[PDB]
Design an enzyme around this catalytic site. Sequence first.
Site, PDB file in Angstrom:
ATOM      1  N   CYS A   1       0.681  -1.033   0.033  1.00 41.15           N
ATOM      2  CA  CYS A   1       0.176   0.035  -0.075  1.00 41.15           C
ATOM      3  C   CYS A   1       0.991   1.397  -0.102  1.00 41.15           C
ATOM      4  CB  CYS A   1      -0.904  -0.074   0.956  1.00 41.15           C
ATOM      5  SG  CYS A   1      -2.032   1.516   1.062  1.00 41.15           S
TER       6      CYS A   1
ATOM      7  N   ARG B   1      -0.287   4.583   2.916  1.00 43.67           N
ATOM      8  CA  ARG B   1      -0.033   4.534   4.306  1.00 43.67           C
ATOM      9  C   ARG B   1       0.260   5.744   5.239  1.00 43.67           C
ATOM     10  NH1 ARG B   1       3.693  -0.669   4.847  1.00 43.67           N
ATOM     11  NH2 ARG B   1       4.387   0.035   2.717  1.00 43.67           N
TER      12      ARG B   1
ATOM     13  N   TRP C   1      -9.523   5.849  -0.439  1.00 46.49           N
ATOM     14  CA  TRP C   1      -9.910   6.290  -1.802  1.00 46.49           C
ATOM     15  C   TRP C   1      -8.907   6.024  -2.942  1.00 46.49           C
ATOM     16  CZ3 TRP C   1      -8.869   9.427   2.707  1.00 46.49           C
ATOM     17  CH2 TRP C   1      -7.553  10.091   2.880  1.00 46.49           C
TER      18      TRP C   1
ATOM     19  N   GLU D   1      -4.907   3.293 -10.566  1.00 41.73           N
ATOM     20  CA  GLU D   1      -5.730   2.057 -10.666  1.00 41.73           C
ATOM     21  C   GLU D   1      -6.995   1.916 -11.474  1.00 41.73           C
ATOM     22  OE1 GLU D   1      -4.042   0.038  -8.748  1.00 41.73           O
ATOM     23  OE2 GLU D   1      -5.362  -1.668  -8.707  1.00 41.73           O
TER      24      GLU D   1
HETATM   25  C1  HEM Z   1      -5.797   6.399   1.553  1.00 38.16           C
HETATM   26  C2  HEM Z   1      -6.100   5.775   0.528  1.00 38.16           C
HETATM   27  C3  HEM Z   1      -5.699   4.699  -0.098  1.00 38.16           C
HETATM   28  C4  HEM Z   1      -4.656   4.539  -1.129  1.00 38.16           C
HETATM   29  C5  HEM Z   1      -4.625   5.869  -2.250  1.00 38.16           C
HETATM   30  C6  HEM Z   1      -4.543   3.272  -1.444  1.00 38.16           C
HETATM   31  C7  HEM Z   1      -3.841   2.685  -2.565  1.00 38.16           C
HETATM   32  C8  HEM Z   1      -3.438   1.520  -2.508  1.00 38.16           C
HETATM   33  C9  HEM Z   1      -2.876   1.051  -3.841  1.00 38.16           C
HETATM   34  C10 HEM Z   1      -2.603   2.024  -4.876  1.00 38.16           C
HETATM   35  C11 HEM Z   1      -2.503  -0.424  -3.657  1.00 38.16           C
HETATM   36  C12 HEM Z   1      -1.573  -1.321  -4.800  1.00 38.16           C
HETATM   37  C13 HEM Z   1      -2.692  -1.942  -5.927  1.00 38.16           C
HETATM   38  C14 HEM Z   1      -3.694  -2.680  -5.454  1.00 38.16           C
HETATM   39  O1  HEM Z   1      -3.418  -3.791  -4.655  1.00 38.16           O
HETATM   40  O2  HEM Z   1      -4.978  -2.931  -5.764  1.00 38.16           O
HETATM   41  C15 HEM Z   1      -3.070  -0.626  -2.493  1.00 38.16           C
HETATM   42  C16 HEM Z   1      -2.813  -1.786  -1.897  1.00 38.16           C
HETATM   43  C17 HEM Z   1      -3.445  -2.293  -0.519  1.00 38.16           C
HETATM   44  N1  HEM Z   1      -3.611  -1.487   0.413  1.00 38.16           N
HETATM   45 FE1  HEM Z   1      -3.987   0.472   0.316  1.00 38.16          FE
HETATM   46  N2  HEM Z   1      -4.836   2.500  -0.292  1.00 38.16           N
HETATM   47  C18 HEM Z   1      -5.513   3.254   0.686  1.00 38.16           C
HETATM   48  C19 HEM Z   1      -6.013   2.896   1.872  1.00 38.16           C
HETATM   49  C20 HEM Z   1      -6.017   1.666   2.286  1.00 38.16           C
HETATM   50  C21 HEM Z   1      -6.610   1.320   3.712  1.00 38.16           C
HETATM   51  C22 HEM Z   1      -7.412   2.032   4.492  1.00 38.16           C
HETATM   52  C23 HEM Z   1      -6.368  -0.025   3.952  1.00 38.16           C
HETATM   53  C24 HEM Z   1      -6.707  -0.862   4.979  1.00 38.16           C
HETATM   54  C25 HEM Z   1      -7.104  -0.589   6.093  1.00 38.16           C
HETATM   55  C26 HEM Z   1      -5.234  -0.381   2.764  1.00 38.16           C
HETATM   56  C27 HEM Z   1      -4.729  -1.581   2.751  1.00 38.16           C
HETATM   57  C28 HEM Z   1      -4.019  -2.061   1.358  1.00 38.16           C
HETATM   58  C29 HEM Z   1      -3.661  -3.453   1.200  1.00 38.16           C
HETATM   59  C30 HEM Z   1      -3.988  -4.553   2.310  1.00 38.16           C
HETATM   60  C31 HEM Z   1      -3.512  -3.677  -0.231  1.00 38.16           C
HETATM   61  C32 HEM Z   1      -3.126  -4.743  -0.809  1.00 38.16           C
HETATM   62  C33 HEM Z   1      -4.324  -5.868  -1.007  1.00 38.16           C
HETATM   63  C34 HEM Z   1      -4.659  -5.820  -2.409  1.00 38.16           C
HETATM   64  O3  HEM Z   1      -3.995  -6.294  -3.396  1.00 38.16           O
HETATM   65  O4  HEM Z   1      -5.738  -5.100  -2.827  1.00 38.16           O
HETATM   66  N3  HEM Z   1      -5.192   0.715   1.815  1.00 38.16           N
HETATM   67  N4  HEM Z   1      -3.605   0.527  -1.986  1.00 38.16           N
HETATM   68  O1  LIG Z   2      -6.523   3.240  -4.451  1.00 41.33           O
HETATM   69  N1  LIG Z   2      -6.133   1.909  -4.930  1.00 41.33           N
HETATM   70  O2  LIG Z   2      -5.515   1.673  -5.894  1.00 41.33           O
HETATM   71  C1  LIG Z   2      -6.630   1.060  -4.109  1.00 41.33           C
HETATM   72  C2  LIG Z   2      -6.063  -0.250  -4.082  1.00 41.33           C
HETATM   73  C3  LIG Z   2      -6.378  -1.309  -3.328  1.00 41.33           C
HETATM   74  C4  LIG Z   2      -7.152  -0.780  -2.274  1.00 41.33           C
HETATM   75  C5  LIG Z   2      -7.394   0.268  -1.911  1.00 41.33           C
HETATM   76  C6  LIG Z   2      -8.259   0.898  -0.846  1.00 41.33           C
HETATM   77 BR1  LIG Z   2      -8.877   0.023   0.795  1.00 41.33          BR
HETATM   78  N2  LIG Z   2      -8.330   2.298  -1.146  1.00 41.33           N
HETATM   79  N3  LIG Z   2      -7.752   2.547  -2.411  1.00 41.33           N
HETATM   80  C7  LIG Z   2      -7.330   1.232  -2.848  1.00 41.33           C
END
Ligand code: HEM
Ligand SMILES: O=[N+]([O-])c1cccc2c(Br)n[nH]c12
Lengths: 400, 400
Positions: free
Chosen positions: A104, A107, A276, A281
């Site tokens: 992620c 973070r 968000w 993505e």
């Molecule tokens: C603040 C907004 C957030 C943004 C901009 C963001 C963005 C991303 C991105 C770009 C990825 C990589 C592509 C993907 O795995 O689909 C990702 C993966 C991940 N994020 Fe974040 N994220 C956010 C919030 C969160 C939150 C609130 C959590 C957990 C409480 C979280 C947990 C994870 C996890 C566990 C993955 C890996 C699982 C997967 O493949 O979907 N994310 N996030």
């Molecule tokens: O923004 N993203 O690409 C993205 C990817 C995978 C998980 C999340 C969450 Br929870 N928020 N945004 C995400």
Amino acid sequence: KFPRVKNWEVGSITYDTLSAQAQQDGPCTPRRCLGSLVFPEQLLSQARDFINQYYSSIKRSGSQAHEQRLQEVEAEVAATGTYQLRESELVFGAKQAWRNAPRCVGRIQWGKLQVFDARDCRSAQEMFTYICNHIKYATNRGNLRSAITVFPQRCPGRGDFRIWNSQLVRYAGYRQQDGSVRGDPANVEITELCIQHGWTPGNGRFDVLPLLLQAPDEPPELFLLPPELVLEVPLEHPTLEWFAALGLRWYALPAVSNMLLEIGGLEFPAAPFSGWYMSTEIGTRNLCDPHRYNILEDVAVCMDLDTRTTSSLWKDKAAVEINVAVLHSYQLAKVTIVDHHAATASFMKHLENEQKARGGCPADWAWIVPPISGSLTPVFHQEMVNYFLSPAFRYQPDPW
Amino acid sequence: KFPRVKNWEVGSITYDTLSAQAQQDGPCTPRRCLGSLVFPEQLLSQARDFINQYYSSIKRSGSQAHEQRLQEVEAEVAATGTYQLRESELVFGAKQAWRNAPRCVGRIQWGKLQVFDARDCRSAQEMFTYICNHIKYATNRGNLRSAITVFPQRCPGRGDFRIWNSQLVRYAGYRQQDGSVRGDPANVEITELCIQHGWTPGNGRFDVLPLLLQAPDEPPELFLLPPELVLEVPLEHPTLEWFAALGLRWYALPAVSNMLLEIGGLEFPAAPFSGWYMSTEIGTRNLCDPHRYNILEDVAVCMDLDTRTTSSLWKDKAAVEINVAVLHSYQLAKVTIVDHHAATASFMKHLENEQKARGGCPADWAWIVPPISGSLTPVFHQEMVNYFLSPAFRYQPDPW
Ligand code: HEM
Ligand SMILES: O=[N+]([O-])c1cccc2c(Br)n[nH]c12
Ligand code: HEM
Ligand SMILES: O=[N+]([O-])c1cccc2c(Br)n[nH]c12
Ligand SMILES: O=[N+]([O-])c1cccc2c(Br)n[nH]c12
Ligand SMILES: O=[N+]([O-])c1cccc2c(Br)n[nH]c12
Ligand SMILES: [Zn+2]
């Protein structure tokens, strides 16, 4: 030894002392690297570690309250083979799990996560209620708020709560007669499972799928999400007038609902979380991946580009525009959205913070670096160390 | 068991059995992954494996000649502590080294490699003549051909033959009083070393640096490559008329010269090699890296783009065009060049071939995927296994 992490752009150097304290082991070995691959006594050992982490986070480690809590957990395990978390511990654990997600890039906002305790959930109907409430609070009419709703943990001698859907908001994928796929090809399996369970399928490219909620020792029930809750954004380009006509669109709330939340040995098979979207993505993975919508060539032809040769970089040129559209359409619609430049820059700030806070940060390079314009982002030139820490979010096999 | 490699676009699966024969260990451990990080008894063992490889390649494994070659190498090592390679083995080994480079995306050409045995070189002046003939051959007036010149191996009783320059052709980097840098910022150290050794510097942005060749136990000597030997390409854009006026250019021959060649326990501290350019390296890395020419912002402004906000994606747009300029320019000047799409597509092919041949292929995902439009290429959705095989090219400390 302490792994030396270098930034090849500025030349800065740091040391990861946090990786040593890493619990579980990964797929890599000194013989070969697999970092690119997408995929009783023990319980007490993990729980004691988690409790320690908690009391240490409130600067009361070694206190009588700390010992009391440790002994209390042990006693619970002796009499039940499991234990229960205090609200304050769950909230702390949930936040840590996100903080530890190596893949992620968002973070930096880990501490602002809103945790909803739904461990008192009695059925699928109540589960659906919690989910709808989550979607309302998180969507907040455009001004998105990161949140997670934790449902009852995995308990001995019974089935667990489960959300069959990979995400709370997904688009249907109808397998066509000729072999193609109308809608999202990544949602084919779950779409058919919705049909077999009594759902009347549509025929559009962007049909919102129903939630297949499963309660303990019970078959999954279909639940329709009220359209007024599912906020969506119509895609259009600032200068490409015909783009709006393509009828493309995407939902505002990215909510993962198939991952397992692990805290102190405890497992929560159901605990959907959301924040968000990062433009790439939607514009690069979802809309342009070959095994997905694959709208790249269509847009390129409409852009009147030379699609005969690869040298013209029509693919690169078409993708950039699709991404510009996503960013444009979301800002116009007033829905939270962040481009890859701002996201990666903030993540660099997160590293610096985590270096001072814990002396390191588990990161997965292949995932932190955006799917387009990689080297144009600071994270590309920054070495990273990938390792598994707990609490954490983990992948799990599908309930079917 | 053996690692399961998977392609997420098509869905195909394979098992890398070749990895199990990794002749050396890497930086990764089950505790953590460091994949994104850029940086007599043993002799006989490596030597024997090498000789075994050579005899397997010409289908004479286990023959008398094979057994005799092994006894000979063993005898030479017992008497001199080292051994001499037969011409045929050198040629074979050099090809395996390129074939084994986990970071090279152009390994489908590993079979067509010209090898110049220069193990009889005795001075810096002779070292220079070899290199010039190498350039003249590889450049081939535009139609580039892969090549490698192998200088005298590392001996126990004397210094090593070294090439101080990281490449046979590179542009000087002059530190200006105002803190800025004119030319290639990545070459400041080697640029100042040439000046410190008697070379009068120039004052341009693209000054071809003189070679700093070092003979055994002797101070390095300066050598100027005749201009007519260095084929350069003026950069212009197909539709952006002002691009050519920027006075940008780049050399045609990319020839790594600071790496060590390892073959059967034998080390070759000097053995420059070259192929041809992949547009991204020039158009994205050399020209767009913040720590390099950093032309992005200037190109964006000239493109009349809005650089006030990141969401406009001005960085991505200017990058795509710069890369288009490189491709267009090389094609115009008729100098061999390959775009990231054609390169990655050929690499997937190389994978399929290697799977049938050796049952696998060592690859570094972070280096294979291009610096831009990563997910638009097939290698992005392809899992990989990284390991060290020998013969191989290795990094070594700078001679100074
Ligand atoms: C603040 C907004 C957030 C943004 C901009 C963001 C963005 C991303 C991105 C770009 C990825 C990589 C592509 C993907 O795995 O689909 C990702 C993966 C991940 N994020 Fe974040 N994220 C956010 C919030 C969160 C939150 C609130 C959590 C957990 C409480 C979280 C947990 C994870 C996890 C566990 C993955 C890996 C699982 C997967 O493949 O979907 N994310 N996030
Ligand atoms: O923004 N993203 O690409 C993205 C990817 C995978 C998980 C999340 C969450 Br929870 N928020 N945004 C995400
Ligand atoms: C035929 C044209 C070739 C193309 C298009 C090509 C392309 C590339 C690219 C894109 C990289 C990554 C950038 C980098 O590491 O600096 C690379 C790395 C590498 N290539 Fe190739 N290559 C070619 C020929 C060769 C040849 C002829 C050899 C060896 C005989 C070779 C050996 C290597 C090695 C050892 C690396 C790692 C370089 C490093 O340490 O930076 N390549 N190549
Ligand atoms: O990981 N890194 O820090 C890093 C820095 C600079 C270039 C590259 C490449 Br190409 N892969 N990984 C890199
Ligand atoms: O084409 N390239 O981008 C490239 C990068 C690094 C080394 C080499 C050699 Br040797 N040929 N081409 C190369
Ligand atoms: O498909 N893959 O082999 C693969 C490897 C490494 C990172 C990613 C991402 Br993000 N999507 N697919 C990936
Ligand atoms: Zn690894």
